[PDB]
């Protein structure tokens, strides 16, 4: 999961075809669990503050079940999409928190997704 | 640089063709600056300790010039290669340190490489 997720989120940010892979298809389904309202808001704060800030905060909320987890991957994916490819974001940090929160649900996420 | 490097190192670890990209070619040249002796040693300690450990340490040495930087990318790349694709390594951490050390030489690395 770890590697796949890093590639997915990154791809979702620059859309570079050469780093695309059909597994993204299934992951992209999770988008549904996330309201484009929140995403839009988040994006706005990120640009208001010129920072990872807001996103890092959302990634720090708790995750008590696989649904929680899926949502967090989704919110990362959409932010990654809408924020811009020119955005100097230290993706390693976001991944660090994100995996800290969902690492444990990886096995089940695999199953649930593939 | 940040994104390219994450993709390169990860690819160098599982060799998944679908995430391959010819820019890797140039980066792969840097291999030369790194002695396969060190890499082998490092790998051994990582397995002796069952951990990121050793690699994290090498990534923490200082980088005072672009040559230093290139070497560190190289050492990351070869470790990534020889360590194994089944190795549960939290790549986000290594990237965190690695970029902390070479982030500043990105622009010049681009130029020097492409």
Author numbering:
A (entry chain A), B (entry chain C): 1 to 114
From the paper:
Functional analysis demonstrates that N1 inhibits apoptosis both in transfected cells and in VACV-infected cells and, consistent with this, biochemical analysis shows that N1 binds pro-apoptotic Bcl-2 family proteins Bad, Bax and Bid. The crystal structure of N1 reveals that it is a dimeric Bcl-2-like protein with a surface groove that is constitutively open and that is predicted by molecular modelling to bind BH3 motif peptides of pro-apoptotic Bcl-2 family members. N1 is the first VACV protein shown to be a Bcl-2 family member and represents another example of VACV anti-apoptotic proteins.
The crystal contains three dimers per asymmetric unit. The structural model encompasses residues 1–114 (residues 115–7 were not visible in the electron density map) and has an Rfactor/Rfree of 23.7/24.4 %. N1 contains seven α-helices arranged with a fold similar to Bcl-xL and other Bcl-2 family members, including viral counterparts. Comparison of N1 with Bcl-xL using program SHP matched 96 Cαs out of 114 with root-mean-square deviation (rmsd) 2.4 Å, and revealed secondary structure elements representing the BH motifs of Bcl-2 family members equivalent to those in Bcl-xL.
